[model samples]
Every structure is written in C-alpha cells, then in structure tokens.
Target: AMNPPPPETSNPNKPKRQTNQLEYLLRVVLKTLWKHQFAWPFQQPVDAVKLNLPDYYKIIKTPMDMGTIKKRLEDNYYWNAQECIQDFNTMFTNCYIYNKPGDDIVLMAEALESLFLQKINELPTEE
Candidate 1:
C-alpha cells in the first residue's frame, strides 16, 4: 500500500471530494502493472527515480489502452462517475495490494461487460 505524502506538500485545509472514479482506478491498475513489470503493452520507464509525476502521467495519457479503458468505463452501465465510485467502495473490503493486480479487476471487467450488454438489450425501441 502507498503511504500518505509528507504534510508539507499537501494542503490540510483542502475540502475532500470523491472525484475521478474510473481514472483513479485505472491509475492504480497501471501502477500495479509497473510494479510487477507487466506493463509491456502499456508502458516502460516508469522508474520513479528517473521520472517525475508529469512523466508518468504522460505515459498513461499517450497509451492507446487509455481509449480502450475509457470506452469500457463508458459501457460499464455507469450513468455517472459517482455510481462507479459507490460500487467500487462497496465492493472492496481490503486495501489495494500494490504487488498484485488481483482477481477482482478481471471479475469486475466480466461483471461490467455482462451488465453493459444486458442493459443494451433493454433500451426502448427507437422510431
């Protein structure tokens, strides 16, 4: 698990808000891949000593997988971002393990795809 950064670099007075549900999950997923050296199709050079936060952001931003990620997120039956956050919060009972991607991601993908396709089947007929 990642630790909180030093207090001097953070704003204690900032208001808390739950934002970027899909994006945040994807970020964690990608970093976990980097940790395990499984980021072949996504990224390399994710070395923290050699790359700053902006550099890592650039890696995630430039990948073709990002578009795939967003497309899946859109099709996951989430009418809004908050729904995904709520579902994720309710589903995860353990701290995200950095060393492993875990089976939940694959299971979540399967469930989301099933739900998405099921939802598509229920849409009202168009004129």
Candidate 2:
C-alpha cells in the first residue's frame, strides 16, 4: 500500500524529470546515512519479541527504519523530499521516546538526526 501507482500518461503537467532529480538526491542522502557507524542499530525494524521489549510496539505505534525508508524511496512512496525527511524524523523520534536521555543509542540517534538535517539543507533547491 505504501507503493505509489505507476504514472499516468494523461497527467502531462507532472514534473517527471524533477521527480527523478529528487529521487537521485534522496538516494545520495540515504546512502550517506547508511554508511554512518551509528546507522547499524537503525538499519532494520526492532525485533520486539526477540529483543524482549513487549512494550516497544505499543509505545511506538509507527516504527521507522533506514531499510524501510530506502524501500519506500525505491518504491516511489514519497511525494516530496519532506515526506522522506519526515520518515527519518520519525525514526529518531522513536529512539528518543524509547531510550533514556543519556543512553548510547539515544546519543547516536541525536547525532544522526543532526546529520540528516544538514544533508537536507545542502540539497539543491527546486525553482
């Protein structure tokens, strides 16, 4: 359901090339995030049962991860850069909510969040 429907030929006004550019930029950003050392913990969904955190699913109703974001990007699930950025934001917010303030994972999430914001700002502006 997250995947977008194929483009329609009737929608001539769609900025097809612009969307491609955005996707390229998103891939670059995602690749950089994936390369970060702190990204290991967030690369995939939290295994609630295996991790023994029964409350995880209840507390974090909407879990987000780097892999999920990458999949969404590949599937054209995002309508704009903000949508992609929001997923990253959600992933970090979940970390902050679940982990204590000074926990190492929380610290990592903080660092990654700042890095993601910086990358977003560095992206080329659309006219």
lDDT of 1 by residue, 1-127 (tens): 2222211212436433333544444454323433433223223222334433344333332222323333334334333444433433322221122113556544443444344444334433322
CA lDDT of each candidate?
0.35, 0.74
lDDT for residue 75 in candidate 2, whole number 0-100 = 59
RMSD of each: 14.1, 6.4
TM-score of each: 0.24, 0.80
Alpha-carbon runs more than 4 Å astray in model 1: 1-102
- Residue 127 deviation, candidate 1, in Å? 3.6
